[PDB]
Amino acid sequence: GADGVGNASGNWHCDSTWLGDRVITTSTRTWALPTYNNHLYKQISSETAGSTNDNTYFGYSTPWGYFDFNRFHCHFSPRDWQRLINNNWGFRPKKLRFKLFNIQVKEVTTNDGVTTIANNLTSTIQVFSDSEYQLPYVLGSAHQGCLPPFPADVFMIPQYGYLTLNNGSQSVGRSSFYCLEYFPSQMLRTGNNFEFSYSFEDVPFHSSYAHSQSLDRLMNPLIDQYLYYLARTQSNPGGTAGNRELQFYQGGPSTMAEQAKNWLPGPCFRQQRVSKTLDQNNNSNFAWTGATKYHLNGRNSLVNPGVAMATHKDDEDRFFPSSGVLIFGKTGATNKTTLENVLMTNEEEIRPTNPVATEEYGIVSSNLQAANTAAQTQVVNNQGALPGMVWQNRDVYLQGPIWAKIPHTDGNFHPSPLMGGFGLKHPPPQILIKNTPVPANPPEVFTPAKFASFITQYSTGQVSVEIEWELQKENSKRWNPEIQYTSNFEKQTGVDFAVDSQGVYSEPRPIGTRYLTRNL
Amino acid sequence: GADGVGNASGNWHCDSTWLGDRVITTSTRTWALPTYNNHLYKQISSETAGSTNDNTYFGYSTPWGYFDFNRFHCHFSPRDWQRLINNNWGFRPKKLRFKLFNIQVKEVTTNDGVTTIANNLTSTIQVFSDSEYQLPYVLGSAHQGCLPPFPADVFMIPQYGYLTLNNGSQSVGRSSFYCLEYFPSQMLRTGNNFEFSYSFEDVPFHSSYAHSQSLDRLMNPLIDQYLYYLARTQSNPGGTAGNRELQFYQGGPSTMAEQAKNWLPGPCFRQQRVSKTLDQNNNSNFAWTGATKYHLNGRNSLVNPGVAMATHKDDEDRFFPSSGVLIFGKTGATNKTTLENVLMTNEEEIRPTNPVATEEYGIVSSNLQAANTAAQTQVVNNQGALPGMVWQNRDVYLQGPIWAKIPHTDGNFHPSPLMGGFGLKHPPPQILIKNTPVPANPPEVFTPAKFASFITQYSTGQVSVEIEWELQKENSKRWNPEIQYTSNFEKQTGVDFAVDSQGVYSEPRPIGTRYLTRNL
Amino acid sequence: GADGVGNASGNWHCDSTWLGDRVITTSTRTWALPTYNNHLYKQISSETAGSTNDNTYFGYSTPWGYFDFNRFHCHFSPRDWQRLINNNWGFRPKKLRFKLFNIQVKEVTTNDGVTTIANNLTSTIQVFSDSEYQLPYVLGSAHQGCLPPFPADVFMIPQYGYLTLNNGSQSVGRSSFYCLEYFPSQMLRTGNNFEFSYSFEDVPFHSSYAHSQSLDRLMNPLIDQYLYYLARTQSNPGGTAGNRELQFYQGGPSTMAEQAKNWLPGPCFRQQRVSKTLDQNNNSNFAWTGATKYHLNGRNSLVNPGVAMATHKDDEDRFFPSSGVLIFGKTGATNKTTLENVLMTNEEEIRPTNPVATEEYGIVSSNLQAANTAAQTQVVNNQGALPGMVWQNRDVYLQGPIWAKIPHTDGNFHPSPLMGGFGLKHPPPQILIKNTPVPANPPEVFTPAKFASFITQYSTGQVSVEIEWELQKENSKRWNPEIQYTSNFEKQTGVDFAVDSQGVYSEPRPIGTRYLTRNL
C-alpha cells in the first residue's frame, strides 16, 4: 500500500458486467480475523477422541487464516445466476483478481468484566498467497468459511490446518510439517493494501444444457435397419412344444430396444435407494451399514457424492441415492437436522446419458449354455469405463463449489471434481493471513523461555474478488419454448432470495445450471 | 444452377482413382423422392401400438427426405475394396464433395384407374445440408435407404424423422420440436443444381491389419527371465503329506503363462454363446431373456454389437456371441429370416489383443486366506478399463457403416462407433430434401382453413458423392506370403458380386479389411 | 425477375439472427391466389341483409388480393419469442424487406366432373405495393389471412375490399371509388420475381417490462412527510357529542393513502365486469345492452378492446372486462364458440399505473357543503386526460397485431393502436396481387359487349418477409430472480407449440411480452 492512517486504501466495488461473450463478476466483503491458537502451531490427532479406525487422523493446526471464495453465490447474485443459466450453454472462468484493503487492527483488553477495544495503529498483519502450490491445499473440500452469499454480511476468516499421513493416531515417517512463517509474506499496516492477479488454465466449458435425446433413442423412428439381431432361439410356439430354431429380425420402429447402437451409458458405481416418505424405507439403520463406500488402506471411506448418475428413475421423484447427491441446508439449520430442513439436489438431466444411481448398470451372461445347461446371467452393479461410453459431469449449483485441485499423480481418468465444477492442476492459490504477534511487556531480566504473553488483538477489513467468466451461446433451432428458471409469481409472505423481517438472508432452494436443451 | 429446361445440369461421373497414398472414389446414382405425410409434420409415439416399457418412444415424422451414403459399398466396388484391403495397413477419409443435378419434378394424376404422369416444369424441390449440426442426427444408426451398392440401381430417398425425450408414450418438458422449413434451403427447378464440399476432421487410420503376435506371447522364447514368481505354496509331494513352503521360480520357455508381462487384454462386457448347429443350443428362448443388455432410465436396451471382442475361441468356429456380431442379409431375405439367409461377420483377428466375447475376462481372488481358510476366487464377467490395457476396434465391412457422430457430452472414453468406422465430432452433414407443395385450385371465396388439397407430385434426379481417402502403406519385412482376399477360382453357376439371370445384384459374403498382418 | 421457366427465381430462407442489440427475423411461406369476383369490381352494402342501423355499410369488393404479415407469430417462433421477452425491456421494428418469387400460374378446366390442372406458362400476375398510401388501408384491422404461424403451412391470399362513407345502405356524395388497375403494377411470369425494401419511421420502444412499484407507493416508507393534510373535521369523539374542529396530520408510514403524491393513474373509460364462473353472472343478456360503446354519427360502436386498463383487481382472477380484453381462439374453434374454446389475455402488469377496467376511476365532490348541508360526492366512471397522469400501453402478444396506421387527422392524443403494437403514420405499404385475365376464345364477329368469358386459373408461389428489430437491454440491479416464460416441465400427451398426431399446429396459450420488471 501507499498512504497513511486517514486515507482509505481501496474503494468498495461489487457489481456484475455482462459484455458480449463474457461476464465479469466483482464482489466485495467485510471480514474479521481472530488470533488462532494463541499464535501456536499445534498437532492434532484422533487420539484425543477415540472415534474409530476409519476416522483416525493426524495433522497440524496453524495460527494462520485463509480466504475462501470457492462457491458460486460468492460471485453471483440470484438474478445474475439466472441470466447465466437461462441464456447460455456453458461457462468457464478466465481471470481472477484479488484485493485486501482498508485494514484495521484492534487491540482488546478485558478488565473487571468490561471489554475495551481500541485501534492499534502500528500493528501489522501478514498475507501471502501460495503461488507455487507448496502447502497442503485444503480448498475444494467444501468447507464453511467462504464469503457469504449476501454482500451486507460480515464473515470470520476460517483457521488453516492440514492433515498428513498417519498410522492410527500416530505419525509415520513421511508425515510432513509445514511452518507457514517459512514463506515470504507481505506485512500490512492500516495504510497498506494487498493485491494479486491470477489466470485460469484452459478448461472445458461446463455443460449448462440438458440433453433433449437419449442414447438409446438416437435412431430414426421411421426407417428400418439393415442389421439383423437374434430374436428367438425357439420356434414360435403353437401351444404344443418348443422346437429349436434360430430366427433373426431387423431392428425397426416396432422394437427399438433390440436395435443396434454405437454407444453405451456412462460408468456407474451403484448406491442404495432411500425414500423421502419414511414409511417406505426399511426399519433399520442402513445409512452407514448399507452404504456404498470405498476401502483405502484399511479405512472405509463413504463414497460421496460419487460418480455422476441420475438420482431417480423417470416417474419416481421421492427416491434419492443414499450418498449420491449434494445436500444443502435451509437457513437456520443446525449441524444435525431432519429431512425437512435440508435442501436436496437431484440430477434428472443426465438420465439420457447416465445410469440411475440407485439401479443396475446392466446384466451380463455368467455361463456357457449348452443343450442340458440353461442360460444364466449376473447383474452389473459396478462398471468401469468401456470403449464407447459417454456421460455427463455432475451439475454445478449456486451454492456449490466452483473448482477443485486435481491431485499431482502419475495418472488420472477424466479428472473432474465429483462434487462439481472445474478440475484444475493449478487452481487459484490459497491466500493465507495472520495477525502478527505483539508481545506484552518482557520481564526486564533476561530469560530464554518462550513468551506466551501477548496483546490480544484482531483485525478487520474489506476483501474484493473479481472473476472473468467466458460464455457459450445457445445456437438451438428448437421451435418450441425452453424451460426457464422462473420466480414464484403467486403471492407469498416473503420474497425468495431476500432478507426477512429479522434481517436474515436466505436461499430457499438450490439452483442448477441445466435448463436449456440440446441434441445428443 | 444456371441454364434452363433442355440443358443437363451435370454429367454422370462414377469412377475410382488410385494415386500414390490416396484414392478418390466417386459414385453417381439415380433417386426418386415421394411426398411424405401429405406435406405434414406429425408426431409419432408408441401409444398407437402398446409394445412394452422398453420400446416406448415419442417423436416426429417430417415430409423431408434425406441422403444416406454411410456404407462403404456405396463408394467402393468389390474390386476397389480388394485393392484397399490387400495392399494397405489403414485408411481414413479426407474430403467429401456432394452434388445434386438433372432434377425432374413429375406431376401424377389418377383418373378412373388410369395413372398419368407428366413433367411439371415450374415446380421446385428444397435442399439444405445442416452444416451446424442443429437437427437431430439420425445418420450412423445403420438404417436402410443408403445409395445401393450397384451403380445401375435406382433408390428411393428415405423419410426423415426423429425421436426426443419421453415419459412412457407422452412427452416431457424437454422434448424438442424442430420445423425444418425454419432453416434456409435452396429451391431448385429442372435447370438448377446443388453442391457442397466437406472436409473430414482428423481421425486415426482404421486398422486393416491383423496382429501376428499375441499379448501373452510377446516374450523371447529362448531366454529366461530374471523375475521370480511364486510357484508353489506346498512342498513337492512325495505321496505322504504336503508341507507348507514358499517356492519361487523364474519364468522361462517352459512356463510362459506364469511369466511376467507388461500388458493386459482389452476390456470385456460378456455375452451369451450361441451355436450354429441347432442341436447344441439349449431348448428355451434365451435370446431376449438370457441376453446381455444395459439398463438406462428404467429401459433395458440390448447391447448390440457391443464392445469389440473376439467372436469365438481358437478351434471353435460354430459358436458366435448372441448380440456380439454384425449380421447382414443375403439377397432376397425378408425382415424375419433363419440362420441360412443371414451373413454373419466374425472378428477372429482381434483374438491376440481382445477377450473372447463369450467367455470370462479372468478370475480374481475373493477372500483373504489363512491357515483354516481356503483360497477363493470369483470369475470376472465384465471388466472396465485398467492401466495397461490394449485392444482393437471392431472391423469395418464393405456393407457396414463408415462413420457415426460422437455425441456432444462432458466426457467419453475412447470414442469409436461400436458398430464400426470413424467416430466424428463433426460428421458429414445431413442433406435434407423435400418436394415443395403445389396447391390445388383454391375455393375462390376466402376461407382461413389449411388447404390439405395439393397436386400429387414426385421428383427424380441424379446424385454424385466423391470422397478422398488416405492410405497407410504396408512396411512389413515378413518373409512368407500374406493372406489375401481371393476370388472363388473353381467354376460356379454365377459370378460373385455380379448380377444373376434376372438382373438382381447380390453380395455373397461380408468382407472385412483385416488380412495383412503386423507385429504386436 | 431475370431467367426463364426452368430456373428458380428465389431461395427459401426462413431463419432468425440474434446479433448484439438487433434481431433479424426472416420468414418464408407458400401461398395460393384464386380469382376473385370473376375479375369484377362490385359494390357491397348492407342492403342485401338488413342488419341494423349500427351495422350498415357501403363499399366495394375487388378482384385484387393482398399480403398480410401483421402478426408477430409470422416473424417469430415460440422460442425466438421467448428469447425476446425474457431478455429485453423493449423492441421496435427498424427495416423491412419483401419478396415474391417462384411464381406458378395454373389453368384449371372442369369437364364431366373431372377437374384438370395444367401449367399456363405465358400467363402473368400483377403485383404492386402502395407506397404513397393512396388506397384505403385495411391492414391493422386484425383480420384473418395473415401468413400462418407455422412455416410448413400453405395459406390463401385474402380478397381486398374497402368501405367508404354511407347514409344507411346508400352512398353519399363523398363516397370514393378506387380502381386498382389505375395504378402502375409489375406483371410477372414464372421467371419474374418481385421485391421491395421498406424502412420503419422512428417509434418508441414497446414496453416489455412490468413495473415493480405502484404510483401510490412510490414514497419512502420509513420517513414522514413535511406536508399536512386535513385528517378530521370533527373532534375525536368520546362517545358524547361530536364537536367541530379542523385537525391536520402529516402523511407518514402509518397512513400512506392520505399522503401527498405527484402523479395520477391513467385515464379510464369504464366497462362491465363478467365472471368466468357462469353462476356468478346475472341472468340476462347484458353483452350488447350493458356494453360500453361509443356513439358516432347515430351509430353505436362497441368499444373494443378500448383504453388500456388492468383487467381485474388484485385477488380476483375470474373476472374480466366485457369488451376490455383481446380474445384468441384455440385451434379448431369455430366462429361461434363458448368460453372453453377461447384464449383470453389479461393485463395484470399495468395495475400499478392503470385503473382496473371494471371499476371506478375515483370519486369527486358533487356539492358545496355548509352547516345544514352534508358533503356529497359522485363516482367517476369515465376520465379524460389530466395533467400528471401516467399510463401504460396495452401489451403485444405473439398472436396479436404488430402495427396499425395512425389516421391522417388534424389532431390525435397519444396515438397508439388500442389493440396493441406500433402506431405508424407511414406503416408498411399494402401489397396487392391479382391474376391477370386471360380471355376465352372471342366470338369471331365483332361485338362491343364485355367478355365475361375467361379461362379459370390461379397462381401459387413463395413469399418471404424480413424485418430487422432493435432491442432494449435489461439494466436492472434487482437482486432476486425475475419471472420468466417457461415450458411445462411435467409430462403431457403432446408438446406445446408443436404439431399433433394429425399434423395440426396449435398455440396453446397467448404470450405477452411483460415479464422482466423495472422501477416506476
Residue numbers in the entry:
A (entry chain L), B (entry chain B), C (entry chain C): 218 to 737
Task: Show the paper's wording.
Adeno-associated viruses (AAV) are single-stranded DNA packaging viruses of the Parvoviridae and belong to the genus Dependoparvovirus. The virions of the AAVs are composed of non-enveloped capsids with T = 1 icosahedral symmetry and diameters of ≈260 Å. They are assembled from 60 viral proteins (VPs): VP1 (≈82 kDa), VP2 (≈73 kDa), and VP3 (≈61 kDa) in an approximate 1:1:10 ratio.
Compared to AAV8, the AAV7 VP showed different surface loop conformations in VR-I (1 aa deletion), VR-IV (1 aa insertion), and VR-VII (1 aa deletion), respectively. In fact, these AAV7 loops are unique among all the available AAV serotype capsid structures. AAV7’s VR-VII is the shortest loop among all AAV serotypes with a 1 aa deletion compared to AAV1-AAV4, and AAV6-AAV13 and a 4 aa deletion compared to AAV5. Greater structural variability between AAV7 and AAV2 was seen in VR-I, VR-IV, and VR-VII due to single aa insertions (VR-I and VR-IV) or a single aa deletion (VR-VII). The only exception was the apex of surface loop VR-IV in AAV7, where aa 455–458 (GGTAG) were disordered, preventing the reliable placement of main- and side-chain residues. In the AAV serotype structures determined in this study, the histidine side chain preferred the “left” orientation in full capsids. In contrast, both orientations are equally adopted in empty capsids, except for AAV12, where the right orientation appears to be favored.
